[PDB]
């Protein structure tokens, strides 16, 4: 049948963890989760973001395990956290995104396209300001916009980009 | 279940 | 007080490596 | 598992990069086509190039 | 690599005058010629010894397999 | 005192027979044999 | 009374 | 009371 102390303890710990998620127990989650370590980890990812004490690391580790082999559930999440967190150097993230897409050919490509768009917006206002210059940044911004346009292709979004270019 | 109950009891005792 | 995820990461790495 | 160029030199092994080759299988005038991403084997990658990490 | 001990041509100790030469060029802001003169190098053989020294040891040391990063 | 230096993290960790040829601290497959205290005679010429 | 007894046991 | 007594003892 059920284990003497060990099986019952695990079940009770899981129940307690569920109760902690229902009611935030930053402390309960920290000790309950530790006891629970003895797939899955969304609650662990959730507790770090819900109760902080910088919640980005655990998700990265989870995403890293079980790679070799719709799409992957661990991952499509990790990517979203990144852009929102950014909202350190981003280029790097964009590079990582490309790498993932290369390895695996909801499409990640859409997420990658969205990420560049954020950079363009920052570029658009910085360029608009006088402190007064004619080429450089404007040409760079135009190139970025074209690149963003290509990825989406292969209405609201397009409209937004256009507005952005005009302001710049 | 019995084991769990026992554990709970023990915990309670400890608390007391 | 609490080891944190750090502990989980270390465990995983060791398992990659032989653990006993 | 990112691997630097330098490890290969010490190891005396080819700094081979992994290739990705996906096919297009069309039968009966391409009524149905299945594409499979498959390993294309390993080929050497030039240092300080786009494929390389440096 | 490091500053050679003694001038190849005559044998005048030059190894103790390397760090002192850079101090005469940095802090004292002197020219190459006057700096060598203050170190006590009048023969052109002793003059070129320090003047022409590369000191690749400082470039070489940056690779240390005994300390992390 | 037996020594083996890791090529990546530079950690001095020696390992005996029936053990994986890898550093314990990090997953690196190359190990530098460290210099131990031994007499090496030389002529100052 | 009962509460007091419990405290003593602890 | 009994408990108290016991404690005292
Ligand atoms: Zn000389
Ligand atoms: Zn190591």
- Torsion sign over Cα A97, A100, A106, A107: positive
E8 neighbors E53 (Cβ within 8 angstroms): no
CATH value at residue E30? 1.10.10.60
Location of structure tokens 């000790």: A31
Domain residues for the domain of E32 are 1-66
Residues in contact with F34: Cβ distance below 8 Å, sequence separation at least 6, in sequence order: F3, F4, F5, F12
CB contact under 8 A, E65 and F9: no
Rounded Cα–Cα distance for residues A110 and A114 (Å): 6
Compute the CA torsion angle A64, F24, F35, F1 (nearest 10 deg): 170
Rounded Cα–Cα distance for residues A120 and A164 (Å): 8
Rg (CA), chain C: 9
Distance F45 CA to ligand 1 centre (A): 20
Beta-strand relationship, F31-32 and D37-44 = unpaired
Rounded Cα–Cα distance for residues A30 and A47 (Å): 8
Q: How many CB atoms lie within 10 A of CB E50?
A: 22
DSSP state of A134: S
Output the six-digit token pair for F11: 């950690």
Nearest to residue C20, comparing CAs of F23, F19, F26? F19
Distance E29 CA to ligand 1 centre (A): 25
Longest dimension (CA), chain G: 15
E45 neighbors E9 (Cβ within 8 angstroms): yes
Distance F2 CA to ligand 2 centre (A): 16
Output phi, psi for D28, to 5 deg: 55, 55
DSSP state of A66: T
All residues with CB under 5 Å from ion ligand 1:
E 7, 9-10, 12, 43, 45-46
Output phi, psi for A142, to 5 deg: -60, -40
Rounded Cα–Cα distance for residues A64 and A81 (Å): 15
Specify the CATH number for F3-45; select among 3.40.50.300, 3.40.630.10, 2.20.28.30, 2.60.120.260: 2.20.28.30
Q: How many CB atoms lie within 10 A of CB F15?
A: 14
A20 neighbors A32 (Cβ within 8 angstroms): yes
- Torsion sign over Cα B2, B5, B6, B7: positive
Location of structure tokens 């010629």: E33
Q: State whether residue D46 is helix, strand or coil.
A: coil
Chains C and A make contact, 3+ CB pairs within 8 Å = yes
Residues in contact with A148: Cβ distance below 8 Å, sequence separation at least 6, in sequence order: A113, A116, A117, A120, A161
- Torsion sign over Cα D14, D22, A107, A39: negative
Nearest to residue A36, comparing CAs of A49, A21, A23? A21
Rounded Cα–Cα distance for residues A30 and A10 (Å): 16
> Judging by beta carbons within 10 Å of its beta carbon (0-12, 13-18, 19+), is residue A120 exposed, middle or buried?
buried
Residues of G in contact with B15 (CB under 8 A): 10
Q: State whether residue D33 is helix, strand or coil.
A: strand
Nearest to residue D53, comparing CAs of A96, F31, A119? A96
Domain residues for the domain of A32 are 4-166
Output the six-digit token pair for D30: 């391409």
The total number of structural domains that make up chain A: 1
Annotated binding site of F: 6, 9, 23, 26
Output the six-digit token pair for A113: 């396209």
Residue-by-residue DSSP string for A67-84: ------TTHHHHHHHHHH
Longest dimension (CA), chain B: 23
Of chain D, the end-to-end C-alpha distance in Å amounts to: 15
SS3 readout for chain E = CCCCCCCCCCCCCCCCCHHHHHHHHHCCCCCHHHHHHHCCCCCHHHHHHHHCCCCCHHHHCCCCCCCCC
E43 neighbors E33 (Cβ within 8 angstroms): no
List all chains that touch chain D, counting a touch as 3 or more CB pairs closer than 8 Å.
A, F
Resolution (A): 4.4
- Torsion sign over Cα E29, E34, E38, E39: positive
List all chains that touch chain B, counting a touch as 3 or more CB pairs closer than 8 Å.
A, G
Beta-strand relationship, D32-34 and D37-44 = unpaired
How far F36 CA lies from chain C's nearest CA (Å)? 29
**Residue-range domain boundaries for chain F:** 3-45
Rg (CA), chain F: 14
The ligand minimizing its distance to the Cα of F15 is 2
């Amino acid at each position: 049948e059920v284990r003497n102390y060990r099986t019952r303890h695990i079940v009770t710990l899981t129940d307690l963890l569920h109760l902690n998620v229902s009611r935030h127990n930053w402390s309960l989650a920290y000790k309950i989760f530790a006891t629970l370590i003895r797939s899955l980890w969304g609650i662990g990812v959730e507790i770090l973001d819900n109760l902080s004490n910088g919640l980005d690391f655990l998700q990265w580790m989870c995403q890293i395990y079980s790679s070799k082999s719709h799409t992957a559930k661990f991952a499509i999440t990790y990517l979203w956290s990144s852009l929102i967190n950014c909202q350190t150097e981003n280029d790097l993230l964009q590079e990582l995104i490309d790498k993932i897409s290369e390895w695996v050919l909801a499409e990640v490509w859409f997420i990658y396209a969205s990420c560049h768009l954020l950079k363009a917006d920052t570029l658009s206002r910085q360029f608009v300001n006088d402190n007064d210059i004619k080429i450089n940044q404007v040409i760079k911004h135009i190139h970025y916009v074209r690149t963003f346009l290509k990825i989406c292709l292969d209405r609201l979004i397009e409209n937004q980009l256009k507005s952005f270019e005009s302001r710049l | 279940a019995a084991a769990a109950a026992a554990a709970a009891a023990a915990a309670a005792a400890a608390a007391a | 007080m609490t080891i944190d995820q750090k502990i989980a990461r270390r465990k995983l790495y060791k398992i990659f490596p032989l653990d006993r | 598992r990112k691997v630097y160029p330098s490890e290969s030199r010490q190891r005396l092994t080819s700094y081979r990069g992994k290739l990705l080759l996906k096919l297009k299988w069309s039968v009966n005038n391409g009524e149905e086509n299945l594409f499979e991403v498959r390993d294309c084997g390993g080929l050497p990658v030039m240092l300080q190039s786009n494929r390389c990490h440096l | 690599m490091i500053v050679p001990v003694r001038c190849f041509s005559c044998g005048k100790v030059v190894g103790d005058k390397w760090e002192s030469y850079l101090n005469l060029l940095q802090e004292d802001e002197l020219d190459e010629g006057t700096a060598l003169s203050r170190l006590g190098l009048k023969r052109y053989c002793c003059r070129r010894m320090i003047l022409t020294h590369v000191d690749l040891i400082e470039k070489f040391l940056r690779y240390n397999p005994l300390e992390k990063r | 005192t037996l020594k083996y230096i890791c090529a990546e993290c530079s950690s001095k960790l020696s390992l005996s027979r029936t053990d994986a040829v890898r550093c314990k601290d990090c997953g690196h497959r190359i190990l530098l044999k460290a210099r131990t205290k031994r007499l090496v005679q030389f002529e100052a010429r | 009374a009962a509460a007091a007894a419990a405290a003593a046991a602890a």
